[PDB]
Amino acid sequence: AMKHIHIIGIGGTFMGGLAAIAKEAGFEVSGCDAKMYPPMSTQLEALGIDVYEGFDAAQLDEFKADVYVIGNVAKRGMDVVEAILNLGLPYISGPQWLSENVLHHHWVLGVAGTHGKTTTASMLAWVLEYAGLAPGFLIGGVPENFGVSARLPQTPRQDPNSQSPFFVIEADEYDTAFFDKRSKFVHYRPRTAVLNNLEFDHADIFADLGAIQTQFHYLVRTVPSEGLIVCNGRQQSLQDTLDKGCWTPVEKFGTEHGWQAGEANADGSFDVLLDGKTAGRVKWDLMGRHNRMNALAVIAAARHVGVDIQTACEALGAFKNVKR
Amino acid sequence: AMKHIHIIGIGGTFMGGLAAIAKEAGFEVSGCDAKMYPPMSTQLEALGIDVYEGFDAAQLDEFKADVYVIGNVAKRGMDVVEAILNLGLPYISGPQWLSENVLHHHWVLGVAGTHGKTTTASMLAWVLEYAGLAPGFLIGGVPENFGVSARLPQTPRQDPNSQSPFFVIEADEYDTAFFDKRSKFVHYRPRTAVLNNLEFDHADIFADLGAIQTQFHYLVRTVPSEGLIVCNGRQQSLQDTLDKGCWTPVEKFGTEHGWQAGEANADGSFDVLLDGKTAGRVKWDLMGRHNRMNALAVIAAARHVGVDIQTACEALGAFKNVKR
């Protein structure tokens, strides 16, 4: 008999993805949040997932759940949180729940960094899908190439009789929950880790990069030595992070000796360089040095799971930006 | 049969105590550590726990455990740890394992602080035993009133067909694991929390006094509103910690307006005072103020579970010292 989870703070792109995946993995899913509105509310409704309005402790009798999965938004003060702790009811964070029930089975490709995460994860998920690797993912927005923001791994083109091991996740650096101050990404145990960039600490704009770099260093501590770190080579803040300790091969991007994007064209195509040698060419309709940097990360990452550079470049040719 | 856990870093009282508890809870237990010695080595033998010498990866070939329980001594670079991560073997921290499999099923009374944790936790365990509550416990030494440093809750005097719900644990402020930088005590969810004191003596594990304050605040975040925080009231560092946020009644010891210990007599006995009123009298052979201070925390915690001041004062008279 499959379990009933009930999410405190079901709203937002993250727990919405976590609920979809949970439902798809055969759990029974219910939750609460502040009143929500289309598209997220009807979408959740369309999955057979009842949604309580508010944080009234009464919902515990109506939703006699097996475990309470707690979102970012939950805090001491809320009646349902207080009732959970008082009654000694089982509770667990979103990230930890996802990792225990889903990610720990999988080859996880995590995309961390302070900026460009959603796009880069979208580009990674697409490359893998284009390459026949049917990835699972959980991303902070509906990528234009798929219908949906979260799914389990599907059937690879070249082994119908089994499930893909690959799962792409946007790896948030924000707190896990009110009772787990560490970054979300600390739970995912990614085997392919993209460190997109490290720009500033959202929680204190006047702060030293120190505390955020530590969180990042804790991510690096969970990556196998047979894994790979795909790191932005143009930022002292990531190099300082790596300098604290690293046990895994690193590929830099945006550098002469690592992966580099060539000069862009009239049509917006550009050469992908590895250690200074031409390896491929991306002809897509995205513009911006930052998108070119993203593509570099995605290519290196995809290679690690066995995607040819050539196949990666054709994939990005069909990548679409999200439409307003 | 029941699950098999393999403890990486099974030496030391905390992980050895964890192994005894796991053993008694029906788990198959084995582990590894550096060359161990009596009395610990023979205690693990008496429990039938296979113990591998060293941290060589080759041990993983002997059998596959259901989960790998990682103690504090584990860190990256160590051969068995690198292999655990590369092979994607399941792994969990000692504290979290103890919490998920034992502590969350119980009423946890957690003893925290920079000093006196071992003594206070022992006193508290003993007071509970004396009152007929057959508590479980995990303590960092062997209390002389008991045979052991750890045990499940036993059957209480009043409910011979029942298990007691009380578990007393020494709530350590040092890290959970190389992959969980939080203090061990954030996994425990105590319903009765003793905060014995707070000085900066962990010079190196913590940047300063503030980092320990933050962890303590994170402890306070998990205490239910119907719980109790029993807190040293002579200390500013603790007051500052509470002002970060508290959602639970607090009782202060060592102050006039809270719990106080009167002057000691020509033999060691003292009055226990509440608000300025005599509540009881302890007849002791123990020395110094630090112990009478501990006594006050213990009586406060004991009262939270329903032990009468009188009975607790009495019990302390029968209290013998701790070992190791």
Automatic annotation (TrEMBL), chains A, B:
Keyword rRNA-binding belongs to the record: no
GO cellular component terms given for this protein: cytoplasm
Catalytic activity line of the entry: UDP-N-acetyl-alpha-D-muramate + L-alanyl-gamma-D-glutamyl-meso-2,6-diaminopimelate + ATP = UDP-N-acetyl-alpha-D-muramoyl-L-alanyl-gamma-D-glutamyl-meso-2,6-diaminopimelate + ADP + phosphate + H(+)
Domain Mur ligase central: 111-302
Record-level Gene Ontology MF annotations: ATP binding; UDP-N-acetylmuramate-L-alanyl-gamma-D-glutamyl-meso-2,6-diaminoheptanedioate ligase activity
Superkingdom classification of source: Bacteria
Residues binding ATP: 113-119
Protein name: UDP-N-acetylmuramate--L-alanyl-gamma-D-glutamyl-meso-2,6-diaminoheptandioate ligase
Organism in which the protein naturally occurs: Neisseria meningitidis serogroup B (strain ATCC BAA-335 / MC58)
Originating gene: mpl-2
